Amino acid sequence: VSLLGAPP
Amino acid sequence: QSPVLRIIVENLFYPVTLDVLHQIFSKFGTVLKIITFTKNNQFQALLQYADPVSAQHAKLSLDGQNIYNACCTLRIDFSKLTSLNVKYNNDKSRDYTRPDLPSGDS
């Protein structure tokens, strides 16, 4: 779905 | 084949720092320099790899992908620039090969 997932 | 990529991060619904771009692009090669800026109401960046093949690889693999869930879409193209000139190491630019640069104009 995305490269890093949920924001830091 | 240029080792420099021109990047646009669309749908910027969460901040994307220079360091996050370094993290993502470092998977495909050695990132030497990065400079970010806002033009035409769009977040953009120039990123220089040591190897043009790394740039080609990153474009093929990352173009169109979202950095975080539901946002921050990478739009990647090749720049005609053969290298990048960075004057400062701060939140908007970084020369990973020159640790002695100031963080801002003297």
Numbering used by the authors:
A (entry chain C): 498 to 505
B (entry chain A): 180 to 285
Could you pull the original sentences from the published paper?
The polypyrimidine tract-binding protein (PTB) is an important regulator of alternative splicing. Strikingly, although our NMR-restrained docking model assumed an extended conformation of the bound peptide, the core peptides of PRI3 and PRI4 in the crystal structures adopt S-shaped conformations that wrap around the peptide-binding surface on RRM2, which is formed by the α1 and α2 helices as well as the β1-α1 and α2-β4 loops.
The PRI3 sequence used in the chimera contains a Glu to Ala mutation at position 5 in the core sequence, a carryover from the previous NMR analysis, but this substitution does not affect binding (Rideau et al., 2006). High-affinity binding by Raver1 PRI3 involves shape-matched apolar contacts complemented by specific hydrogen bonds, a new variant of an established mode of peptide-RRM interaction. In PRI3 (core sequence: SLLGAPP), Leu 2 and Leu 3 both project in the same direction into the binding pocket on PTB RRM2 because of a pinched backbone conformation that is stabilized by an internal hydrogen bond from the side-chain hydroxyl of Ser 1 to the backbone amide of Gly 4. In this conformation, the peptide is able to make four hydrogen bonds to PTB RRM2. Pro 6 of PRI3, which is conserved in the other high affinity motif, PRI1, makes apolar contacts with Tyr 247 and Tyr 193 that are likely to contribute significantly to binding affinity.
